[PDB]
């Protein structure tokens, strides 16, 4: 740089030389003088000079715009609708290429958060991730994803390449513990059990067509075979290759984290796991 070489010849930078970047500080306009204040910008004496102009929306007496118009329920149940952040396959190929998501392990929702691929916020009632078919062509990855919704074409794009998709469910509580697990293990509570879907979503997660986590593992080869026939690819058998033991692992329902169990208390400090051995707690946590 020539610029530090300029700094040799100049006097030392002190607290007496400093100056803001020109354009940063607009100057304060205040009502003194001939221009900035005689009426001081309020105009002639009315109601807008006195300071008492009526509320926003008041049209002076005719019925206002925002009230002449019929109530319709656009926003009727807005805060109970479920939301699902999209994760395109273009995005997920992008994360796999740059080392941010390791495809030689299961891709739960924690692994998409820790790679900072997807930001999901459980308040503002996101119920998790939905896979999105964008970038299905040019998706070249053998992967094991657990994503709460998935379109057919995204299941097809993963399962073509030797992948596994499953759609899990998470409560707001459970989803909140999944996304940011470390501020949960500082909360001192035992790991809870994730709840089953409500009645609206039980027919979703019990269908083998959209790869539900509560569905038969006896109806899956028919569905994998059907997509393989529809979108014209020969269905590879996952059983042959070496990642199969990795590509088979699911956590059962009522299990939030992968290798852990509900009812355990993670002791982050001295790196232990306290497990309960009372029978009533074991009936409650293994329910």
């Amino acid at each position: 740089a020539r610029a530090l070489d300029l700094l040799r010849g100049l006097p030392r930078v002190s607290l007496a030389n400093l100056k803001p970047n020109p354009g940063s500080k607009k100057p304060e306009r205040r009502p003194r003088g001939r221009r900035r204040g005689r009426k001081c910008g309020r105009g002639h004496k009315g109601e807008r000079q006195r300071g008492t102009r009526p509320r926003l929306g008041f049209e002076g007496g005719q019925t206002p715009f925002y009230i002449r118009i019929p109530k319709y329920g656009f926003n009727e149940g807005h805060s109970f609708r479920r939301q699902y952040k999209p994760l395109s396959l273009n995005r997920l190929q992008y994360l796999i290429d740059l080392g941010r998501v390791d495809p030689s392990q299961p891709i739960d929702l924690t692994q998409l958060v820790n790679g900072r691929g997807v930001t999901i916020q459980p308040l503002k009632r996101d119920y998790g991730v939905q896979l999105v078919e964008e970038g299905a062509d040019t998706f070249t990855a053998k992967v094991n994803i657990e994503v709460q919704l998935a379109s057919e074409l995204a299941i097809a794009a993963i399962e073509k390449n030797g992948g596994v998709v499953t759609t899990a469910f998470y409560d707001p509580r459970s989803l909140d513990i999944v996304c940011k697990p470390v501020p949960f293990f500082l909360r001192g509570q035992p790991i809870p059990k994730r709840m089953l879907p409500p009645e609206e979503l039980v027919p979703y997660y019990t269908d083998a067509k959209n790869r539900g986590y509560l569905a038969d593992p006896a109806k899956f080869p028919e569905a994998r075979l059907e997509l393989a026939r529809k979108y014209g690819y020969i269905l590879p058998d996952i059983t042959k290759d070496e990642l199969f033991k990795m590509l088979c692992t699911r956590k059962d329902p009522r299990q939030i984290f992968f290798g852990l169990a509900p009812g355990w208390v993670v002791n982050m400090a001295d790196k232990k796991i306290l497990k309960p051995t009372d029978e009533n707690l074991l009936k409650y946590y293994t329910s």
């Binding site: 910008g41 309020r42 300071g51 008492t52 102009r53 509320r55 926003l56």
Partner: protein, 97 residues
């Protein structure tokens, strides 16, 4: 004639005071002390405005809910009337809406 006839005593300022020499130390206690403290935990002042900035109506609301239970009687009363005034001013008066 409101102007003074003799010039005032000189203002002797010690630039190398203890406070001035050590001003600004531990402003970066976060970014180079492994984030164990925030710099806002360096500031001392009223308990209702340590690491918080608001306009006046918000300073009054925050002061009332944070410390208002042990405020003196006519201070509490003056402060209730200031929130009531400043409410009626910010919400119903001005130029822009």
């Amino acid at each position: 004639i409101g102007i003074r006839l003799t010039l005032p005593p000189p203002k002797v300022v010690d630039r190398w005071n203890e406070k001035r020499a050590m001003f600004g130390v531990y402003d970066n206690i976060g970014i180079l002390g492994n984030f164990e403290k925030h710099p806002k935990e360096l500031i001392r002042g009223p308990i209702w405005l340590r690491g918080w900035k608001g306009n006046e109506l918000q300073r009054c609301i925050r002061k009332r809910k944070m410390v208002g239970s042990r405020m003196f009687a006519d201070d509490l009363h003056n402060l209730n009337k200031r929130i009531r005034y400043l409410y009626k001013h910010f919400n119903r008066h001005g130029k822009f809406r």
